[PDB]
Write a protein that binds this ligand. Structure first.
Ligand SMILES: Nc1ncnc2c1ncn2[C@@H]1O[C@H](COP(=O)(O)OP(=O)(O)NP(=O)(O)O)[C@@H](O)[C@H]1O
Ligand SMILES: [Ca+2]
Ligand SMILES: [Ca+2]
Ligand SMILES: [Ca+2]
Ligand SMILES: [Ca+2]
Length: 472
């Protein structure tokens, strides 16, 4: 029973209009197709893409895209909350990003300084390192598909639009000639390729950030593709002030032969990306102490509670609500790939001890390793060996703060699929995407939670489960 944020995406049995209220339109696309909506229960704002069935094989491709978004949890990848379908429409309910496309920043300035470009490309590369590690290739990276989270000058980047994305395998190469002319890798046009195609597109973006201009240009799509296919580019007047390090990274990402082209991971490790700032994220002792405290108290959580907390943490908390936790996550993620590993958690504990002025030799040699092994197992909801962003936020967040009245109510209705007012073992099975929950799993829920002995969990019991007979 692996819990992931993606298991909640298509799980509601409710109709869209019973969960969301439309406000204003959003974006610069066809009018009314993306709408800012409010969650009727929590008040959470979201961006809804409404697709008419008149406008979509196409149904299959939309579903594939939803399936891919359900498998990705990363601070630089768009978050999908929910997906609804009715007789007339599909509704893609997404986290709202209000800073506009990177494309619009580009066309409103001459070019980016190296430091501003490095911050952007570092985030893109974190996103794609993570994607590639999860066997997913984007295939349409470009500035139109990179949204800034807000208008704040320090807004993060989110990779959007997975409409061309697919899984890839080591054994079988990809063949579909798919992409956008300025950004598409030559081997994609030749028709045999792998995930290095995303690295090339990111190299094109970087070249544009630093110069203002595409490396392969021309009067029309046909002319652009002819330059792309040859692969010849030049650093031809702005380039005189650009550092040798920046050029070196571009040379490596626009390396023509794909077997010789740098990987996303190695590009994330490039000296230009690694050393563009020495500024440290500010995290005070009390916030880190509290986060660690919360994480280490999580062992022993039963399966209904676990799924309910992950739902609330991964779907019902905004960026504003999780500011402090997000900073701690990025500080602990030493290799900047947007996932926490065993070695990174170990270092996080040693960091905390140093910060608190604790003497580390007062513990057994492997005390920290033993701690992290227990903690990691417990907090790794999908058991893939990493702490993803949403797993981290869920567990590290102050529990009383997470368990608001509205979040509790939303979470209960999400589990109670038939609206009977009680959660059954079979509703537990369905949320985890399995046929049946075994007797031991359900019995361990009931022995703690089923206070009236009826074999199901009502709203009262569900609140008490999470809150000392708490009820909001
Ligand atoms: N999660 C989001 N939050 C806020 N705005 C978004 C989000 N996703 C897309 N938009 C914007 O809504 C507009 C249309 O979105 P989308 O439906 O993705 O466009 P499209 O059909 O792919 N072609 P285009 O709209 O020209 O990019 C664009 O301005 C997007 O930037
Ligand atoms: Ca990491
Ligand atoms: Ca995990
Ligand atoms: Ca029920
Ligand atoms: Ca009961």
């Amino acid at each position: 029973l692996h819990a992931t944020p993606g298991m909640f995406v298509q799980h509601s049995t409710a109709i869209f209009s019973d969960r969301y209220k439309g406000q204003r339109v959003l974006g610069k696309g066809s009018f009314g197709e993306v709408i800012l909506c409010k969650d009727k229960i929590t008040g959470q704002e979201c961006a809804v893409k409404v697709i008419s069935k008149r406008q979509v094989t196409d149904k299959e491709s939309l579903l594939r895209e939803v399936q891919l978004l359900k498998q990705l949890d990363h601070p630089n990848i768009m978050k999908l909350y929910e997906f609804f379908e009715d007789k007339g429409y599909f509704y893609l309910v997404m986290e709202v990003y209000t800073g506009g496309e990177l494309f619009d920043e580009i066309i409103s300035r001459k070019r980016f300084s190296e430091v501003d470009a490095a911050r952007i490309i570092r985030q893109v590369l974190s996103g794609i390192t993570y994607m590639h590690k999860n066997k997913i290739v984007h295939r349409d990276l470009k500035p139109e598909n990179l949204l800034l989270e807000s208008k704040s000058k320090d807004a993060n980047i989110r990779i959007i639009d997975f409409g061309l994305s697919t899984h890839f395998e080591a054994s079988k190469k990809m063949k579909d000639k798919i992409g956008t002319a300025y950004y598409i890798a030559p081997e994609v046009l030749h028709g045999t390729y792998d995930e290095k195609c995303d690295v090339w597109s990111t190299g094109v973006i970087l070249y544009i950030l630093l110069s203002g201009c595409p490396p392969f240009n021309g009067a029309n799509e046909y002319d652009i593709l002819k330059k792309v296919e040859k692969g010849k580019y030049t650093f031809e007047p702005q380039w005189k002030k650009v550092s040798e390090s920046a050029k070196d990274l571009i040379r490596k990402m626009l390396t023509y032969v794909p077997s010789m082209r740098i990987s996303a991971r190695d590009a994330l490790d490039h000296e230009w990306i690694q050393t563009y700032t020495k500024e440290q994220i500010s995290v005070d002792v009390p916030s880190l102490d509290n986060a660690i405290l919360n994480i280490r108290q999580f062992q022993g959580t039963q399966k209904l509670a676990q799924a309910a907390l992950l739902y609330m943490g991964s779907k019902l908390t905004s960026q504003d609500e999780t500011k402090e936790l997000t900073a701690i996550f990025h500080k602990m993620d030493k290799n900047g790939d947007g996932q926490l590993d065993r070695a990174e958690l170990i270092e996080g504990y040693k960091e905390l001890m140093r910060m608190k002025g604790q003497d580390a030799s007062m513990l057994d040699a492997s005390a920290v390793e033993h701690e992290v092994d227990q903690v990691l197992d417990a907090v790794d909801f999908d058991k893939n060996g990493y702490i993803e962003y949403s797993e981290f936020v869920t567990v590290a967040m102050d529990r009383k703060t997470l368990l608001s009245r509205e979040r509790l109510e939303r979470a209960f209705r999400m589990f109670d699929s038939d609206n009977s007012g009680k959660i059954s073992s079979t509703e537990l099975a369905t949320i985890f995407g399995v046929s049946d929950v075994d007797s031991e799993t359900w019995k361990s829920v009931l022995s703690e939670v089923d206070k009236n002995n009826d074999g199901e969990v009502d709203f009262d019991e569900f609140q008490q489960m999470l809150l000392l007979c708490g009820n909001l």
